[PDB]
Amino acid sequence: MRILVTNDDGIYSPGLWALAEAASQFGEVFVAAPDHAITIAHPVRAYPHPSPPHFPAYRVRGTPADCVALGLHLFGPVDLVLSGVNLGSNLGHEIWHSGTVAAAKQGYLFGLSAAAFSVPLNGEVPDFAGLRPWLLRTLETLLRLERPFLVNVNLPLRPKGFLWTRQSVRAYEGVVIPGEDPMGRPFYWFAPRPLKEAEEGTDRWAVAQGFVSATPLRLDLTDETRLQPTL
Amino acid sequence: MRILVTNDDGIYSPGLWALAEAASQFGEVFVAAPDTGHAITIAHPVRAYPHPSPLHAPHFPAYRVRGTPADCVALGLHLFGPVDLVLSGVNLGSNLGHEIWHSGTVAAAKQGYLFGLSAAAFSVPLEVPDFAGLRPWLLRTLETLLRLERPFLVNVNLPLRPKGFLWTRQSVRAYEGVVIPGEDPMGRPFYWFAPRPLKEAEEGTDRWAVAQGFVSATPLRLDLTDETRLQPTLAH
Amino acid sequence: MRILVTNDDGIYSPGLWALAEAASQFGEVFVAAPDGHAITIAHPVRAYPHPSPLHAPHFPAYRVRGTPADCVALGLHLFGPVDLVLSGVNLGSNLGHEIWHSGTVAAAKQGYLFGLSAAAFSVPLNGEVPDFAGLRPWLLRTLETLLRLERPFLVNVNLPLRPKGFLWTRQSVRAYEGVVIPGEDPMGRPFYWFAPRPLKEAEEGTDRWAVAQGFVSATPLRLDLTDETRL
Amino acid sequence: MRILVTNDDGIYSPGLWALAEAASQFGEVFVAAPDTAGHAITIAHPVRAYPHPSPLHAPHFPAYRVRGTPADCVALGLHLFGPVDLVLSGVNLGSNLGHEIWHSGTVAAAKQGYLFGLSAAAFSVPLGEVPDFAGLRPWLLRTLETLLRLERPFLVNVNLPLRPKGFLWTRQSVRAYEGVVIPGEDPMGRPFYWFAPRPLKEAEEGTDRWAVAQGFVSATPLRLDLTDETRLQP
Numbered sequence: 053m054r055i056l057v058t059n060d061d062g063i064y065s066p067g068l069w070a071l072a073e074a075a076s077q078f079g080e081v082f083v084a085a086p087d088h089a090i091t092i093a094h095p096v097r098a099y100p101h102p103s104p105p106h107f108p109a110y111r112v113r114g115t116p117a118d119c120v121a122l123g124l125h126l127f128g129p130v131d132l133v134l135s136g137v138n139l140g141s142n143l144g145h146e147i148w149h150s151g152t153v154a155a156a157k158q159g160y161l162f163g164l165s166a167a168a169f170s171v172p173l174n175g176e177v178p179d180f181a182g183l184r185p186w187l188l189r190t191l192e193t194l195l196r197l198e199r200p201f202l203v204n205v206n207l208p209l210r211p212k213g214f215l216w217t218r219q220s221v222r223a224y225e226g227v228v229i230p231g232e233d234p235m236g237r238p239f240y241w242f243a244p245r246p247l248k249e250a251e252e253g254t255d256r257w258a259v260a261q262g263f264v265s266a267t268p269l270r271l272d273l274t275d276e277t278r279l280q281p282t283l
Numbered sequence: 284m285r286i287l288v289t290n291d292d293g294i295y296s297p298g299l300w301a302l303a304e305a306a307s308q309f310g311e312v313f314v315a316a317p318d319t320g321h322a323i324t325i326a327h328p329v330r331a332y333p334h335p336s337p338l339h340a341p342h343f344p345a346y347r348v349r350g351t352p353a354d355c356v357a358l359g360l361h362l363f364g365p366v367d368l369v370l371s372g373v374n375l376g377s378n379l380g381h382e383i384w385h386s387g388t389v390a391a392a393k394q395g396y397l398f399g400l401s402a403a404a405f406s407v408p409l410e411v412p413d414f415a416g417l418r419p420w421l422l423r424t425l426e427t428l429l430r431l432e433r434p435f436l437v438n439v440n441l442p443l444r445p446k447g448f449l450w451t452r453q454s455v456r457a458y459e460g461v462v463i464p465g466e467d468p469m470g471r472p473f474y475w476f477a478p479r480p481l482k483e484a485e486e487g488t489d490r491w492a493v494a495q496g497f498v499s500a501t502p503l504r505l506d507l508t509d510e511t512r513l514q515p516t517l518a519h
Numbered sequence: 520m521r522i523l524v525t526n527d528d529g530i531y532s533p534g535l536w537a538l539a540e541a542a543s544q545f546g547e548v549f550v551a552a553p554d555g556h557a558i559t560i561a562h563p564v565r566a567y568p569h570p571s572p573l574h575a576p577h578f579p580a581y582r583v584r585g586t587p588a589d590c591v592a593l594g595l596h597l598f599g600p601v602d603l604v605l606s607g608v609n610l611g612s613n614l615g616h617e618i619w620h621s622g623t624v625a626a627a628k629q630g631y632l633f634g635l636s637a638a639a640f641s642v643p644l645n646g647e648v649p650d651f652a653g654l655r656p657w658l659l660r661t662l663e664t665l666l667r668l669e670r671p672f673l674v675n676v677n678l679p680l681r682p683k684g685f686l687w688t689r690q691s692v693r694a695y696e697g698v699v700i701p702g703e704d705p706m707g708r709p710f711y712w713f714a715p716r717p718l719k720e721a722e723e724g725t726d727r728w729a730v731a732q733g734f735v736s737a738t739p740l741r742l743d744l745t746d747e748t749r750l
Numbered sequence: 751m752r753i754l755v756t757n758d759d760g761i762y763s764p765g766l767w768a769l770a771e772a773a774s775q776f777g778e779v780f781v782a783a784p785d786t787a788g789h790a791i792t793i794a795h796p797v798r799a800y801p802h803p804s805p806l807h808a809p810h811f812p813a814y815r816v817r818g819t820p821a822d823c824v825a826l827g828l829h830l831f832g833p834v835d836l837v838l839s840g841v842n843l844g845s846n847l848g849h850e851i852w853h854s855g856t857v858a859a860a861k862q863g864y865l866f867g868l869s870a871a872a873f874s875v876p877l878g879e880v881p882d883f884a885g886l887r888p889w890l891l892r893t894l895e896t897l898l899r900l901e902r903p904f905l906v907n908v909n910l911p912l913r914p915k916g917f918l919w920t921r922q923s924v925r926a927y928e929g930v931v932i933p934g935e936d937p938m939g940r941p942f943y944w945f946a947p948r949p950l951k952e953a954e955e956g957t958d959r960w961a962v963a964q965g966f967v968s969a970t971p972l973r974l975d976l977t978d979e980t981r982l983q984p
């Protein structure tokens with residue numbers, strides 16, 4: 053099988069090459085990563101770029117979705133699109149605005165299977181050598197799914213297991229803190245907080261428990277419980 | 284009721300004031316719009332300044348925010364609290380189908396909903412809209428939305444000249460990839476991306492409705508979970 | 520004469536239309552405004568016919584998906600031949616060191632480079648916004664005197680909110696003091712506030728001095744950055 | 751003396767480290783460069799900056815990666831490493847000749863240093879090749895030697911050919927342009943315009959553009975004052 057690997061962090065992220073290497077154990081790997089929708093207003097420029105295992109690669113001056121569209125052109129046919137490993141979580145409400153997820157979604161929109169990968173972080177750096185067996189296990193599992201699939205994956209720095217999950221959906225409380233710069237000019241701090249603890253079975257909960265979280269995603273944002281007849 | 288009006292095109296967009304004026308027929312309206320990401324800025328302080336509403340528009344207390352549309356919502360709920368409804372738009376440009384995912388206009392409405400309020404995004408597929416002629420339809424759509432059980436989150440697209448209204452579902456089409464190489468006047472190479480949908484928009488969808496000249500109203504969910512694959516059968 | 524009017528704040532800015540109307544008292548006006556500051560090269564620019572505001576004289580106009588300089592290049596093409604390029608009225612000052620990187624000035628300079636006369640107009644502020652109805656007589660007076668100059672000219676104009684006079688001026692060139700105040704983001708990570716300040720008051724006769732006095736400042740600009748005194 | 755080195759291309763540019771290493775032959779070098787590739791000091795929000803490490807193969811220079819503009823780097827650099835005697839910006843990967851000087855972030859950083867009362871110089875290399883910094887090192891050293899004997903403070907814009915054969919003090923090339931608009935349509939029939947304005951004549955002898963075409967390192971002293979004083983009493 054032929055795999056396109058991309059991301060949101062750009063062609064220099066160590067997360068990108070960790071994903072490329074893991075994927076190479078399952079098929080031929082090609083890389084196209086940024087230097088979130090597909091650019092159509094103007095043309096995009098992309099350039100051959102060296103990998104750090106050698107992977108044919110292009111650094112694209114466009115969005116992660118542009119990378120997918122270009123990658124299909126440069127390396128078609130492609131069977132699977134993998135996006136990440138993003139340095140930083142992509143959990144719950146974060147999925148909406150994730151560039152990493154957008155690339156995987158684009159792949160899905162083109163009729164391919166796809167998955168996004170992110171590692172939640174904060175004060176510690178990802179040890180990709182340590183994460184490798186968990187990446188391979190995850191990939192192995194995703195490749196056993198009925199195709200095509202679209203999955204959002206988050207891996208704790210040091211996994212203890214794997215769980216399929218629902219997206220965490222929590223209400224938020226707005227918090228705004230007025231203030232002023234050392235020069236007296238006014239500004240505002242925003243620190244909205246979730247109203248409750250992440251629920252069991254959710255991506256956020258799973259990661260906090262030390263488990264790899266894999267959430268299957270839907271493309272249809274329609275709330276069918278509110279659809280209406282014509283009046 | 285108190286209404287916070289925002290948008291993604293900025294404080295000078297005629298679409299913003301059209302929405303604020305329409306909304307004023309239903310309650311107290313306050314404006315917080317960007318001076319020019321769709322998540323709330325938390326890593327650092329954001330600037331916001333009192334802003335004079337346009338001369339040829341009713342007065343509206345207003346702030347121009349140096350942040351995202353979602354920041355405007357967070358800020359607006361603080362300065363004009365309490366707020367019952369968040370209206371975002373009217374965006375100069377459509378927000379249909381796959382577009383909803385990346386819309387800053389929608390992100391603002393969604394933020395209000397994440398805070399527990401009712402919210403709607405409004406967009407016009409563009410020519411340039413004639414908000415004088417769209418007013419009656421903006422009023423009709425708003426009246427209709429205000430009869431809904433609360434809270435609600437709806438994405439509205441008004442064609443340039445509406446001939447009706449329809450509740451619709453989001454168009455979700457598969458696309459075929461189309462890349463066309465080219466070179467600029469200087470001989471440098473580039474790539475045109477022109478992906479195309481595999482089929483015509485289906486009836487009942489937002490794209491179809493707008494193409495038929497109808498105002499489209501799609502109720503949106505926040506949960507992106509594909510609930511049919513939580514316990515997937517795995518090949519042997 | 521035929522006048523091309525553009526700006527940096529965009530097609531919806533009230534300062535743009537204030538300048539167009541004023542300019543219409545001196546020749547046929549055409550508008551091309553933004554929907555970087557150099558002309559976009561070997562990279563397609565989009566432009567659309569645009570309707571002039573309800574409460575304003577009719578003006579053929581286009582909104583351009585590009586830079587102020589692009590507006591000038593495209594404007595001379597769609598409305599040729601043009602004799603004068605006016606840029607503004609910018610919402611914000613363009614005094615002293617600010618001129619160098621000003622987008623409003625960049626458009627006027629582009630017009631000069633194409634062999635035409637041009638002027639940039641800006642209204643400094645911070646507290647309130649401009650009342651272009653009040654400034655109209657002063658805009659008309661400025662334009663009138665500007666149009667008695669030998670052509671081609673390149674002039675930078677700053678009009679205080681409530682002007683009580685007009686003076687030709689030279690750009691203020693002050694030395695600045697570096698001021699940096701450390702701070703912390705929510706995670707305790709460090710960031711820095713910058714508040715550089717001028718070392719002395721603006722010299723008499725300079726653009727910044729004139730505005731502080733309440734006068735409309737008109738500075739003729741050079742295109743040559745060479746410091747001949749050191750060659 | 752103490753030298754702050756920055757650039758427009760960012761902390762990973764080979765151009766930045768070539769300049770830093772060359773400057774190190776003349777004083778203590780400190781680096782503050784953009785996290786990634788406007789030009790004014792940021793005052794709206796505060797700016798983040800992080801200590802940046804030196805690789806195994808290179809000499810160590812205290813350095814910070816700055817999430818702001820080249821001018822922010824100079825302001826921050828003066829704070830974290832002050833007092834600083836000189837500000838060097840570059841070596842930019844691309845030219846900064848003639849009209850380009852106006853919109854150059856490389857030049858903006860040098861100019862910021864000058865506005866702070868320090869001597870400063872911007873360095874750029876017109877490139878379809880990859881600059882050979884080992885081959886340009888001698889020219890960087892010679893140029894610095896020349897700059898360091900000038901009366902201070904100074905502000906100079908330097909452009910080095912890929913393979914220089916000499917050095918020349920020059921004036922900025924200033925040419926009138928001819929507008930060229932070539933319409934087109936994208937694959938979906940939608941119209942657009944190509945801009946290809948061209949200078950009305952070839953670069954004059956003595957100018958920075960001419961010098962570089964000849965194979966010479968071009969050094970142009972710049973002025974901060976944009977006033978055209980020949981038209982003050984029109």
Ligand SMILES: [Mn+2]
Pocket residue numbers: 060061138139140151152
């Ligand atoms: Mn990312």
Ligand SMILES: [Mn+2]
Pocket residue numbers: 291292374375376387388
């Ligand atoms: Mn918009």
Ligand SMILES: [Mn+2]
Pocket residue numbers: 527528609610611622623
């Ligand atoms: Mn401006």
Ligand SMILES: [Mn+2]
Pocket residue numbers: 758759842843844855856
């Ligand atoms: Mn550069």
